A paper describes a structure:
The long-wavelength beamline I23 at Diamond Light Source overcomes these limitations and extends the accessible wavelength range to λ = 5.9 Å. In this study, we report the determination of diverse protein structures by experimental phasing techniques carried out at long wavelengths on beamline I23 at Diamond Light Source using S, Ca, K, Cl, V, I, Cd, and P as anomalous scatterers. Native-SAD uses light atoms naturally occurring in proteins or bound to proteins. We demonstrate that long-wavelength native-SAD has become a very compelling technique, where a low multiplicity dataset from a single crystal can be sufficient for successful structure determination, making it a general vehicle of choice for experimental phasing.
Using this protocol, we selected 10 projects solved by S-SAD phasing at the beamline, including soluble and membrane proteins. Structures varied in size with molecular weights ranging from 14 to 114 kDa, sulfur contents varied between 0.9 and 6.5%, and diffraction resolution from 1.8 (detector limited) to 3.4 Å. The overall multiplicity for these datasets was below 26, which is four times lower than the multiplicity typically needed for S-SAD at shorter wavelengths (100)10.
Numbering used by the authors:
A (entry chain A), B (entry chain A), C (entry chain A): 7 to 152
Amino acid sequence: VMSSPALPAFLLCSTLLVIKMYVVAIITGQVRLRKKAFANPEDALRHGGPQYCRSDPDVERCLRAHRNDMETIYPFLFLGFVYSFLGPNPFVAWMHFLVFLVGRVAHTVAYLGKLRAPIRSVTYTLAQLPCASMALQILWEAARHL
Amino acid sequence: VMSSPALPAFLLCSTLLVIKMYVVAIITGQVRLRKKAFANPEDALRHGGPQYCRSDPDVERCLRAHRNDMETIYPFLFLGFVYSFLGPNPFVAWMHFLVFLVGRVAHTVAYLGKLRAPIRSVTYTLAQLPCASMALQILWEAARHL
Amino acid sequence: VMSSPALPAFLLCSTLLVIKMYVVAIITGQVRLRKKAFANPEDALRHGGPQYCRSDPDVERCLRAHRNDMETIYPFLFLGFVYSFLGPNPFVAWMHFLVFLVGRVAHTVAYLGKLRAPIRSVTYTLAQLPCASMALQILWEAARHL
């Protein structure tokens, strides 16, 4: 965890984000039960009948939040790990990681809370700043070693 | 592959899971051809006409299985790799990795086989146990290094 | 970046692919605005009214391209990283990585450009060759260390 001074910060923020995605998956399963909206007939028939094999607007929203996480956290997991080893200023580094962690946690709150536009979209942009900063840094760093 | 005693177990289980996802992608393409259900008009027009640009319940099921894999295996790939280096008891470690591998392989069998509830849901929960165990371990380990 | 001779090639191709996915996300947001097709009512109400909470065929296509990237680049990110450390012939290695990079960049061009079948499907198969080559190599390498 100490092979770079930035790596505990990265691993802390990264695993909190993975746990955070795990929390989104739990919430999705609870909305499915409460609105009785199942994607599979074998699920619906178990919970009351085939008419519960149906889509629901609130389940659809949960699925959109999880998908957006996969579009952003998974690249951060690669980028921040590699960036951790480009020996960033460990302050700047956890600033990157913390900005991303705080922005992504805020993103999920704005999506599932149905918060008015443009809250969700602002949080997405903030989180992408450290990632973009990290990807450019890694690119020059790798490019100049070719 | 030996920078930690847990790492061959992790890499073996991890790559089997990646190959397993690759197998799910192959199956999806075969259902699309057999039911003639294409997502894109350029695909449909190539296979018989625009009326084959259509959704199918069995293709939809394949897409749900692949998506659930992305929600779970990809975090395991990060978590199990990092956990491999927290020097777990290499028995416990491959127990984590094997429980996850066996549970996820069982999950895909239950989804695409249309197995009665709650088989698919039980397999998902078993696989998430080692991941949750791994994420908590990594969190304390990184937190205490900050 | 030099802990293996294959690793700069891998990191260069990998981050270009991550940036490439980031570009796909940007394009998706622009199609949503131009066709006025929003997935959330809080978004639609902000851009003209609830009738703009609607699906669009061109937004749907962008989402399919991003999803396919997640199915393929994310495993490459794991596989190519690990393969980088199995000390491949650094020529073969960047050949793997370059074939994947060039194939995946071509895949996105064929999807969003609505190119006639089977262009998109050919590019997907080319990119999967190095990944399959990498996964088999990692599997034997890890299996024989168990």
